[PDB]
Short mmCIF file of C-alpha atoms and ligand atoms in Angstrom, two decimals:
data_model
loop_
_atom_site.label_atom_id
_atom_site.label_comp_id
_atom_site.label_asym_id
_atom_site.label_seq_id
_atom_site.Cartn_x
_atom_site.Cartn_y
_atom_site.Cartn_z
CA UNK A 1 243.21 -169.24 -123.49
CA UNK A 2 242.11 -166.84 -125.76
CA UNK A 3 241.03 -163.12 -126.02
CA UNK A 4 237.74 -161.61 -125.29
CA UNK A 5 237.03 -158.28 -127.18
CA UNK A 6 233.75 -155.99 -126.35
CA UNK A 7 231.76 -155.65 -129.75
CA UNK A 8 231.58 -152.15 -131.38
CA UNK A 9 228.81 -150.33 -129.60
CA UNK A 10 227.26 -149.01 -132.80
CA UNK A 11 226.06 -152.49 -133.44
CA UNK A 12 225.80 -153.69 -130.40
CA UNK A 13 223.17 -150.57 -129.46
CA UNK A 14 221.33 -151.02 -132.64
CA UNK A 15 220.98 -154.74 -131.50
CA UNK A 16 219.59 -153.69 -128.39
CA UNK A 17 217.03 -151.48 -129.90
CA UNK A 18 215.85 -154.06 -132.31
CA UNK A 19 215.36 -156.21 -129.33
CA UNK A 20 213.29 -153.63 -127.97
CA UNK A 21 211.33 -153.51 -131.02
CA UNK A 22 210.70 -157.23 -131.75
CA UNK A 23 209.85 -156.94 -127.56
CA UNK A 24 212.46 -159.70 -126.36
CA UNK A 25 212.59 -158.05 -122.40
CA UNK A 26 215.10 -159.58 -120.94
CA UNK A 27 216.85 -158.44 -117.92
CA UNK A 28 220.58 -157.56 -119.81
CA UNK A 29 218.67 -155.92 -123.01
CA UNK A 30 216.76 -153.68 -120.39
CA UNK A 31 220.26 -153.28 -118.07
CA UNK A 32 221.92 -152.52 -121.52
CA UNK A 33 219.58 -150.05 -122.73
CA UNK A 34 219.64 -148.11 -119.47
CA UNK A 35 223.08 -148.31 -119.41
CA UNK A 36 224.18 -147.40 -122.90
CA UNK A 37 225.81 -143.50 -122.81
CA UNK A 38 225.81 -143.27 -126.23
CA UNK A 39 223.19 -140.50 -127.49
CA UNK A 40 222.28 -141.53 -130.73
CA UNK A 41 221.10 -145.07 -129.09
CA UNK A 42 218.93 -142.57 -126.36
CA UNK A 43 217.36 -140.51 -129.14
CA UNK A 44 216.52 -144.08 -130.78
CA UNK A 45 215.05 -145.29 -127.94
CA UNK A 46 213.25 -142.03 -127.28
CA UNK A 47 211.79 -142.22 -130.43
CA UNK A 48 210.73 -145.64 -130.24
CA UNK A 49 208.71 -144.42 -126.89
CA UNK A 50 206.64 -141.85 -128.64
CA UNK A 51 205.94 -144.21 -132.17
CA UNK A 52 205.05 -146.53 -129.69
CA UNK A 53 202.95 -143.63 -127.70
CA UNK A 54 201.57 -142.66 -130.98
CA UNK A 55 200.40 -145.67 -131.80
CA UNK A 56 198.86 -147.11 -128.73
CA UNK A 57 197.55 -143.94 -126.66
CA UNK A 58 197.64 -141.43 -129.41
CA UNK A 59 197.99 -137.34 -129.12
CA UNK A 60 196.09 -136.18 -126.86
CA UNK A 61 197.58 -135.53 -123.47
CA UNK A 62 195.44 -135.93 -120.44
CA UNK A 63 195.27 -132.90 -117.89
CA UNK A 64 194.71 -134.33 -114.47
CA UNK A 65 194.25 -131.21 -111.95
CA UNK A 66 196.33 -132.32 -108.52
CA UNK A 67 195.32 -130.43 -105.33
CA UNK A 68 197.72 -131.29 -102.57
CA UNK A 69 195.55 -130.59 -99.64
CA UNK A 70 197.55 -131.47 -96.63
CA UNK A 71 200.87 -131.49 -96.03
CA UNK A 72 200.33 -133.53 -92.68
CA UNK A 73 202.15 -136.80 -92.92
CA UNK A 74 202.30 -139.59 -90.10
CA UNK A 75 205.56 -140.89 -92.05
CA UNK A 76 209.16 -140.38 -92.50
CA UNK A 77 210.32 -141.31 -96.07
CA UNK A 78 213.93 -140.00 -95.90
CA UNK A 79 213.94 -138.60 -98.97
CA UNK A 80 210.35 -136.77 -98.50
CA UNK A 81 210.42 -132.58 -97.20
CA UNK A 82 207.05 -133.19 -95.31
CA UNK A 83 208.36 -136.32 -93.41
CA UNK A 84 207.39 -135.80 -89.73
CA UNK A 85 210.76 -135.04 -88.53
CA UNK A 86 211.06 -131.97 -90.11
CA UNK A 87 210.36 -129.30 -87.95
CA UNK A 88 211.66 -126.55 -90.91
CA UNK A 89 207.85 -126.71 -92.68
CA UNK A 90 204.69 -125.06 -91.77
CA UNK A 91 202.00 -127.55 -91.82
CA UNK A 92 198.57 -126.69 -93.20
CA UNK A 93 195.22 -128.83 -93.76
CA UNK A 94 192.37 -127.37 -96.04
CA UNK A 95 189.07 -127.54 -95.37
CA UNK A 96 186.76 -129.81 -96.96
CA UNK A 97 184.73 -126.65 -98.21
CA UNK A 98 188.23 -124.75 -100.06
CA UNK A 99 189.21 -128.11 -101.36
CA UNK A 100 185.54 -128.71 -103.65
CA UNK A 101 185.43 -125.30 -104.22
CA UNK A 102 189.07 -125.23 -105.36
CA UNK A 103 188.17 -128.82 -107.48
CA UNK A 104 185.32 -126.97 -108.75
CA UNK A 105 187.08 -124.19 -110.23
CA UNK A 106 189.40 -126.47 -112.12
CA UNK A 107 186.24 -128.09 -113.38
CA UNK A 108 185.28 -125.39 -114.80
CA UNK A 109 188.80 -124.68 -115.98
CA UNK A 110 188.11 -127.96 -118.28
CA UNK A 111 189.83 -130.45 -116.23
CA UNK A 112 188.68 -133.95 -116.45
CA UNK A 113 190.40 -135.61 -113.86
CA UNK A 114 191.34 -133.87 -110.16
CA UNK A 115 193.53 -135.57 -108.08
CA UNK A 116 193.46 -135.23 -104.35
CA UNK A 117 196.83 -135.33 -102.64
CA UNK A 118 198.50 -135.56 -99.11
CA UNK A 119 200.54 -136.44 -96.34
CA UNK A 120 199.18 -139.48 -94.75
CA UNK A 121 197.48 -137.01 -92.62
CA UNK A 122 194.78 -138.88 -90.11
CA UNK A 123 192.68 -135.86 -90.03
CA UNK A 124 191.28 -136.89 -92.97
CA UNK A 125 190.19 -140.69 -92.81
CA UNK A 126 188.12 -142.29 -93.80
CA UNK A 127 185.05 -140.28 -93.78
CA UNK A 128 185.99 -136.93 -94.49
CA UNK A 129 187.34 -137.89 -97.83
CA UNK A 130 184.67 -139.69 -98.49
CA UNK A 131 182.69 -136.81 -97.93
CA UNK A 132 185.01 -134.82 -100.40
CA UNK A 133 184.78 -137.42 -103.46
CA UNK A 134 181.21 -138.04 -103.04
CA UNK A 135 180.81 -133.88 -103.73
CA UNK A 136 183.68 -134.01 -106.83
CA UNK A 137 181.99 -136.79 -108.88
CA UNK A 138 178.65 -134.29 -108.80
CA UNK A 139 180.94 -132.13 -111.16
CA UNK A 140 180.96 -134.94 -113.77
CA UNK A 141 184.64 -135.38 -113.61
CA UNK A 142 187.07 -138.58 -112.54
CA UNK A 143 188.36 -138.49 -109.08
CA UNK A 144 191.92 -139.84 -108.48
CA UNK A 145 193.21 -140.15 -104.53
CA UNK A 146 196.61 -139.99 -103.65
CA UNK A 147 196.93 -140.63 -100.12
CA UNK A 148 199.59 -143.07 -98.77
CA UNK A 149 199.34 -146.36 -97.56
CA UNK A 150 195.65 -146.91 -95.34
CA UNK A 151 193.29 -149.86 -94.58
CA UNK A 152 191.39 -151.92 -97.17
CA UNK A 153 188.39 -150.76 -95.32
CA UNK A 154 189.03 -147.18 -96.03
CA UNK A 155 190.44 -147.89 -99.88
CA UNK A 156 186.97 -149.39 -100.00
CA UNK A 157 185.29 -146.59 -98.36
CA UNK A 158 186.52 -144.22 -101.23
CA UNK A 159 185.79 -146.11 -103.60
CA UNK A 160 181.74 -146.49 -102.47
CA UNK A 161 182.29 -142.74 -102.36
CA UNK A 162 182.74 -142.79 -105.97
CA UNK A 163 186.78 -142.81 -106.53
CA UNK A 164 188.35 -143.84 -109.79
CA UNK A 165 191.53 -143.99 -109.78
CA UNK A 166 194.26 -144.13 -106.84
CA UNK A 167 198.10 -143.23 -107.10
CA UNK A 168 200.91 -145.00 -105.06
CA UNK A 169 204.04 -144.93 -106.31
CA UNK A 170 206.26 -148.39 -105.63
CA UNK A 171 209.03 -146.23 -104.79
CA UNK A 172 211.71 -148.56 -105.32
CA UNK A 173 210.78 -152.53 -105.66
CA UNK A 174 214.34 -153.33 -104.07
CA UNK A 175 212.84 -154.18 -100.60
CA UNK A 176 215.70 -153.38 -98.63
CA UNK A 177 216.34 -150.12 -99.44
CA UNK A 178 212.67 -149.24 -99.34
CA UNK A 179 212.58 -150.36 -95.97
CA UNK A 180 215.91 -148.19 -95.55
CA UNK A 181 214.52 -145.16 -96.82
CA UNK A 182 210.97 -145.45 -95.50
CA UNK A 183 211.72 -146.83 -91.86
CA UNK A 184 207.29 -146.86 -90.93
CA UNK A 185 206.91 -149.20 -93.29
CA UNK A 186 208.20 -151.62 -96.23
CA UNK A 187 207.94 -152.65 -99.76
CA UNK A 188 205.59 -155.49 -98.87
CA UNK A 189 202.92 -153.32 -97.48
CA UNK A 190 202.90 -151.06 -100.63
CA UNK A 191 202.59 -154.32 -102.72
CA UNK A 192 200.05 -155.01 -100.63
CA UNK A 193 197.86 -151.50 -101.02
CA UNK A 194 198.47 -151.78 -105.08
CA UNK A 195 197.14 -155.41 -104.77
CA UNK A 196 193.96 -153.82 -102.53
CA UNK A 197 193.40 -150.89 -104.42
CA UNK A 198 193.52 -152.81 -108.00
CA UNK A 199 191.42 -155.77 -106.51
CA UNK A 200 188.52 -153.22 -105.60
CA UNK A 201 188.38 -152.13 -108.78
CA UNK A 202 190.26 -148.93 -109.20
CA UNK A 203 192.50 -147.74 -111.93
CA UNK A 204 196.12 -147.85 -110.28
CA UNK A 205 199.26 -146.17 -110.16
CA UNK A 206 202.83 -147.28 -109.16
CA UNK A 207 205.98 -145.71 -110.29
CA UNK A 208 209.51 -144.99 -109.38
CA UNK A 209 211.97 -142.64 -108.24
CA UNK A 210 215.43 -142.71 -110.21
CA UNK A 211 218.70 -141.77 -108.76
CA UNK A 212 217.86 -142.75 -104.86
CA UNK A 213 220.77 -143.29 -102.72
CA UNK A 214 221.88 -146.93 -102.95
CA UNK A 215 219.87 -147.68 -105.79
CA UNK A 216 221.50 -149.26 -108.68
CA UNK A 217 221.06 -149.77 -112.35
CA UNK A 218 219.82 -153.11 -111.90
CA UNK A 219 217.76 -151.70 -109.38
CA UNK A 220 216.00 -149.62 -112.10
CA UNK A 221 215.67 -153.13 -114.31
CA UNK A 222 213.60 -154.25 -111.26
CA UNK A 223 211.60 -151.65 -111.23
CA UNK A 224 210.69 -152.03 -114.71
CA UNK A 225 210.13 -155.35 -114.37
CA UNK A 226 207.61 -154.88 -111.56
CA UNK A 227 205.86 -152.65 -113.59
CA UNK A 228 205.52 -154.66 -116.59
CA UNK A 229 204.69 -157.56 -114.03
CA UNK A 230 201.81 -155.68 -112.90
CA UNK A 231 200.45 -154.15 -116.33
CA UNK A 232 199.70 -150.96 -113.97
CA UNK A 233 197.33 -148.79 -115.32
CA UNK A 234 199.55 -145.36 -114.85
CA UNK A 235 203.17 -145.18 -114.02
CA UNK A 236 204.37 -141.96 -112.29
CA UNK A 237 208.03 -141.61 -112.56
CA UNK A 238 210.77 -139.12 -111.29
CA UNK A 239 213.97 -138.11 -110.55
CA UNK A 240 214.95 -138.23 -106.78
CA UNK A 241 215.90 -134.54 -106.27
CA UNK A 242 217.29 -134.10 -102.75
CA UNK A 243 215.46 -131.85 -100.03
CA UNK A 244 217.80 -129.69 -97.53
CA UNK A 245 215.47 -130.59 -94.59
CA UNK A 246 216.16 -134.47 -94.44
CA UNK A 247 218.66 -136.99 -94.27
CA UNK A 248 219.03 -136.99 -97.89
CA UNK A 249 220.18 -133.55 -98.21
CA UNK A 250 223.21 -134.28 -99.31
CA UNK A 251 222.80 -137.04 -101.40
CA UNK A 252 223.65 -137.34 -105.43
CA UNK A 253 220.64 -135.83 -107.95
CA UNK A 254 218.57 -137.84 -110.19
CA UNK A 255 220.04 -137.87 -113.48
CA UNK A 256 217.38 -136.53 -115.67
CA UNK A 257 218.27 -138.39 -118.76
CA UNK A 258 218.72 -141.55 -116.78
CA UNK A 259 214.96 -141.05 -115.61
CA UNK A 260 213.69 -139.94 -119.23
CA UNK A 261 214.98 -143.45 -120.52
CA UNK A 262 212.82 -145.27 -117.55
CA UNK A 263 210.22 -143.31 -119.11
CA UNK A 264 210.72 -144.61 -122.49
CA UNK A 265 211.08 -148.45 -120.95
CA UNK A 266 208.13 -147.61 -119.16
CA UNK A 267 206.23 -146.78 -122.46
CA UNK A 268 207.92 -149.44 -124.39
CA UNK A 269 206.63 -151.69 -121.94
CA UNK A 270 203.39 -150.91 -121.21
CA UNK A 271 202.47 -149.40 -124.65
CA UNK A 272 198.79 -148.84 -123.63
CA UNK A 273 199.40 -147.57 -119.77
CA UNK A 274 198.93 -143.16 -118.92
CA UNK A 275 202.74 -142.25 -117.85
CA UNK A 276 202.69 -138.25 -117.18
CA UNK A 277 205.33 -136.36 -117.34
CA UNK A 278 205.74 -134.92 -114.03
CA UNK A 279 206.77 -132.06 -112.21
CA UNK A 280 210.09 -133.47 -110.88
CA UNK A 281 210.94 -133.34 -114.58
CA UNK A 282 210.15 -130.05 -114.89
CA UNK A 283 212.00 -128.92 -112.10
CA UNK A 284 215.48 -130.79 -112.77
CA UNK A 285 215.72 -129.33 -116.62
CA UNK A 286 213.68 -126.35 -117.91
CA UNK A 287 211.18 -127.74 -120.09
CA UNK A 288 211.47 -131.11 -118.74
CA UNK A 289 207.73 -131.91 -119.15
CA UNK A 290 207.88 -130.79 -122.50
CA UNK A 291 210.74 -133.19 -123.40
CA UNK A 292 209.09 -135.78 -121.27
CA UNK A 293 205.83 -135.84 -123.15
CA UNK A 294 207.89 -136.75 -126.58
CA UNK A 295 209.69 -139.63 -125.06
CA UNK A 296 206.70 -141.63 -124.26
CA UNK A 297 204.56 -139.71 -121.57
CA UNK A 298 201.12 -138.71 -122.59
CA UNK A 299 199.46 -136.87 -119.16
CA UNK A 300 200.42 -133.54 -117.66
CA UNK A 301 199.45 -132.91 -113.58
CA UNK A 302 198.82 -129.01 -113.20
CA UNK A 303 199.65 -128.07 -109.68
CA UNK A 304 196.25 -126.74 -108.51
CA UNK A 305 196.51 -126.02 -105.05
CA UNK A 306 195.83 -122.80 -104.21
CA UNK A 307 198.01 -119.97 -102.09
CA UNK A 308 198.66 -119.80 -99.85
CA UNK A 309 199.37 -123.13 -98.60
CA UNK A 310 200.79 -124.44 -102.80
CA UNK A 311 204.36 -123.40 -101.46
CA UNK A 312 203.94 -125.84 -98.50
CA UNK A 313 203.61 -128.37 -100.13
CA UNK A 314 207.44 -129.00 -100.66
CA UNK A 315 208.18 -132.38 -101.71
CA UNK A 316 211.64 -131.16 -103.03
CA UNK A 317 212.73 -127.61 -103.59
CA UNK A 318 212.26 -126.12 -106.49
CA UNK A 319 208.60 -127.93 -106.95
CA UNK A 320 206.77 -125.01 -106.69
CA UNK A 321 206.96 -121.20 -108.46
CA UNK A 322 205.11 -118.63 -106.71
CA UNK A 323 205.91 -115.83 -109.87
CA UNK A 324 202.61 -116.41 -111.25
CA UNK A 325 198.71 -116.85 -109.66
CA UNK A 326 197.46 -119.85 -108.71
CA UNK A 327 195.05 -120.12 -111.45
CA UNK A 328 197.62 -120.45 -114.14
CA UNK A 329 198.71 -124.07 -114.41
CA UNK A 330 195.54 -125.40 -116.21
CA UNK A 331 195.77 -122.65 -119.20
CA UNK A 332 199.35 -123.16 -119.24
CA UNK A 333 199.49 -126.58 -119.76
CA UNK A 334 196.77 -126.53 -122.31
CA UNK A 335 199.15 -123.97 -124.59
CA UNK A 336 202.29 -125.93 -123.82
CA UNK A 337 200.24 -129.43 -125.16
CA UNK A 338 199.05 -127.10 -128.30
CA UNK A 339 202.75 -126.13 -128.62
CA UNK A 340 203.56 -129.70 -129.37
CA UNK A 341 201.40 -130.33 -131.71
CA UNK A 342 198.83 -132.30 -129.61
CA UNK A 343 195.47 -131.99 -127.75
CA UNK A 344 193.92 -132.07 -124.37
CA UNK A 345 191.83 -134.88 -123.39
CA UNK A 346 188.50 -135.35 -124.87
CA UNK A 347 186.89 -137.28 -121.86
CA UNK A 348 188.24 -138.76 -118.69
CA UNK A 349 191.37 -140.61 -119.67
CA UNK A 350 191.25 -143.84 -118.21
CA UNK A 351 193.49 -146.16 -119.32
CA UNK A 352 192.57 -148.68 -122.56
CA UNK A 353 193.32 -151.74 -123.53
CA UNK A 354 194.39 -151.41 -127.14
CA UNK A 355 197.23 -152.98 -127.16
CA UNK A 356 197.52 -157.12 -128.57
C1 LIG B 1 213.55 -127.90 -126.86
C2 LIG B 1 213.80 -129.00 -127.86
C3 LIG B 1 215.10 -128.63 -128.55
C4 LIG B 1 215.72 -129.96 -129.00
C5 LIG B 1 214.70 -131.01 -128.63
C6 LIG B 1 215.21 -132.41 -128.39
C7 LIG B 1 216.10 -132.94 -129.50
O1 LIG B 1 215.42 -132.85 -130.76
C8 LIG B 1 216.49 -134.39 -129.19
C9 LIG B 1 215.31 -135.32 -128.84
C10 LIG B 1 214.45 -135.67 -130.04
C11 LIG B 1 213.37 -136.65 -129.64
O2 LIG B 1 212.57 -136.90 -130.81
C12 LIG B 1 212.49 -136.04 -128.54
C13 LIG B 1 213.35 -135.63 -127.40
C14 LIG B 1 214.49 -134.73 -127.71
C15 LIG B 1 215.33 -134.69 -126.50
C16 LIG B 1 213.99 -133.33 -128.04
C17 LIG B 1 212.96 -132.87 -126.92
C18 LIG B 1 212.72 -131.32 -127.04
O3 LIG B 1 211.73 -131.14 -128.04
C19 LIG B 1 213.96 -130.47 -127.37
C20 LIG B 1 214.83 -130.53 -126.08
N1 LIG B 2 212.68 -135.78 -102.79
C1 LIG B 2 211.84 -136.21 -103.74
N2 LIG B 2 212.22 -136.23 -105.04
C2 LIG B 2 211.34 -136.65 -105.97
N3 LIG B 2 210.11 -137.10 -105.75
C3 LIG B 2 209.75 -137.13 -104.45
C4 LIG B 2 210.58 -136.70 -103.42
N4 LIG B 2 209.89 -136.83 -102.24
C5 LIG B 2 208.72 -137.36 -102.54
N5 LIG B 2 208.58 -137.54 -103.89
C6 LIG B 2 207.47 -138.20 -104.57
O1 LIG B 2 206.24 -137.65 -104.21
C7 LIG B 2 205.26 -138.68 -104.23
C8 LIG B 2 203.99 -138.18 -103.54
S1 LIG B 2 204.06 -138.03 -101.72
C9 LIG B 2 202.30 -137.74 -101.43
C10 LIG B 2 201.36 -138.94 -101.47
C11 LIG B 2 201.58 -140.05 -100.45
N6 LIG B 2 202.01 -139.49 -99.16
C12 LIG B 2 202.59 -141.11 -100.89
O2 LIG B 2 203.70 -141.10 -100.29
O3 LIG B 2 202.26 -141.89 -101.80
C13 LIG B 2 206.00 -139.84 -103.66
O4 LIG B 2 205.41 -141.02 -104.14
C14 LIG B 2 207.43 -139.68 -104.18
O5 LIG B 2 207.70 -140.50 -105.30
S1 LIG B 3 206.48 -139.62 -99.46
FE1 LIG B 3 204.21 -139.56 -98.87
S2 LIG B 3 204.27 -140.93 -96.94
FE2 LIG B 3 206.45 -140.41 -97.29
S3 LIG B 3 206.87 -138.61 -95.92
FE3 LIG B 3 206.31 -137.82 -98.04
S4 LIG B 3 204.11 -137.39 -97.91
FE4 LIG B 3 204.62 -138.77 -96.17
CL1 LIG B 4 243.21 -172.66 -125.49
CL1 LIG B 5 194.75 -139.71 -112.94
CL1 LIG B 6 202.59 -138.98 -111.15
CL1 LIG B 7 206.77 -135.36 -109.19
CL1 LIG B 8 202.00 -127.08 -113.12
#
């Protein structure tokens, strides 16, 4: 027998990021990468997201307006403040009337793109979103739904009613601990939805939470893998940042740079696919968006729903600032994209195929 020396990390992270380049995705280079601590390997890779943004997606930065209309949920996710079981939230629905009139304004605003948010609130479905979209896509805009896990027959309901695009984030593809941490349901039936939704003919969104109790780095690998299995057309990813009011409470942080580096992957991966950089980001560092958006993201979500029910909406503490009005996301965003040196969105955003 005979010794077995590691190999300076140096070359051994330069190795990995020429993998990355030459796009040789194996399951260690991806473990590797995401486990690497060194920071000059993270800027690396971090800059290899945004050539790679550059190349494929370009500068401008897509402004989707998201109006979180209900914070009524039917579910439990453990991790989730507006899971049924806590008691510690006032619930609120909008109308039908404040939430077109609210889309409107955005319109007007300039946004291309409003997404319509909940709880898996049955108030709602089918036909009163339906009802909602159908008034929206008179404004000349994309619609994008965002409502949990529901029927084929009301997926296809929406989209009749004129829907483009529909957000469900994978949550974790380990299927055990998605069943552990969303008890209604499982990993299977959200497959199952993104399968739906995609087969109908919509523009689809999965995406990942990073830092979840139990999950590990290979964990993460599988999640990247699923995505790049996929070829989803937006990827919404985020730290897990723990809520007081659930189980979770107590629980260990997303680690932001962790989550910026799925990012990256993410872009790496799907060179072509609309990643935003999203509020969870923001919240864990200040600025986070702003980082986010030069490590491969390339869409911004402006919180537009409106007092007073936008500090009810509380995913995860810390989500929402009440210090300014409820008008000022959309101009915000639009000076923080000039700041970078890039533009707003010239039409609707969908995703392209330009890459191979
Ligand atoms: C606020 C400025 C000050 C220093 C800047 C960062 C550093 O430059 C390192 C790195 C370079 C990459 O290129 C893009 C990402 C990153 C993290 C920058 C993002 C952001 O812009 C920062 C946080
Ligand atoms: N504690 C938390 N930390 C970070 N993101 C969280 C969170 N709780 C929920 N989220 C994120 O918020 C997203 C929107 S929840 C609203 C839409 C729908 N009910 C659904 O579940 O798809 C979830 O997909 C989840 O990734
Ligand atoms: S993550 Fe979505 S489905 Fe789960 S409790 Fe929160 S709002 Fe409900
Ligand atoms: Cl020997
Ligand atoms: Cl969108
Ligand atoms: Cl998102
Ligand atoms: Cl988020
Ligand atoms: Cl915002």
């Amino acid at each position: 027998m005979w010794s077995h020396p590691q190999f300076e990390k140096a070359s051994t992270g330069r190795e990995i990021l020429e993998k990355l380049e030459r796009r040789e995705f194996t399951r260690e280079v991806l473990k590797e990468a995401l486990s690497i601590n060194d920071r000059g390997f993270n800027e690396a890779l971090f800059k290899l997201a945004d050539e790679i943004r550059r190349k494929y997606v370009g500068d401008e930065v897509h402004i989707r307006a998201i109006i979180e209309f209900s914070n009524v949920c039917r579910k439990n996710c453990l991790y989730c403040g507006l899971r049924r079981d806590n008691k510690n939230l006032k619930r609120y629905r909008m109308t039908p009337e404040e939430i077109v009139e609210r889309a409107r304004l955005a319109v007007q605003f300039g946004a291309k793109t409003i997404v319509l948010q909940s709880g898996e609130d049955p108030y709602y479905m089918p036909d009163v979103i339906s009802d909602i979209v159908k008034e929206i896509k008179k404004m000349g805009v994309a619609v994008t739904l965002s409502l949990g896990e529901w029927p084929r027959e009301y997926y296809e309901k929406w989209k009749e009613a004129g829907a483009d695009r529909y957000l469900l984030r994978h949550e974790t593809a380990n299927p055990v601990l998605h069943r552990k941490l969303r008890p209604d349901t499982s990993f299977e039936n959200r497959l199952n939805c993104l399968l739906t939704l995609k087969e109908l003919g919509y523009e689809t969104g999965a995406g990942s939470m990073v830092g979840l109790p139990g999950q590990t780095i290979d964990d993460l690998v599988d999640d990247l893998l699923f995505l790049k299995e996929h070829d989803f057309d937006m990827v919404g990813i985020g730290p897990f940042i723990p809520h007081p009011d659930t189980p979770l409470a107590n629980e260990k942080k997303g680690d932001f740079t962790l989550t910026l580096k799925m990012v990256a992957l993410t872009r790496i991966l799907l060179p072509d696919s609309n990643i935003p950089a999203t509020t969870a980001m923001g919240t864990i560092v200040p600025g986070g968006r702003e980082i986010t958006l030069r490590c491969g993201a390339n869409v911004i979500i402006p919180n537009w729903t409106p007092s007073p029910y936008r500090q009810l909406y509380q995913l995860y503490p810390g989500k929402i600032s009440v210090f300014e009005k409820d008008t000022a996301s959309i101009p915000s965003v639009m000076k923080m994209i000039e700041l970078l040196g890039r533009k707003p969105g010239r039409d609707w955003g969908g995703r392209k195929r330009v890459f191979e």
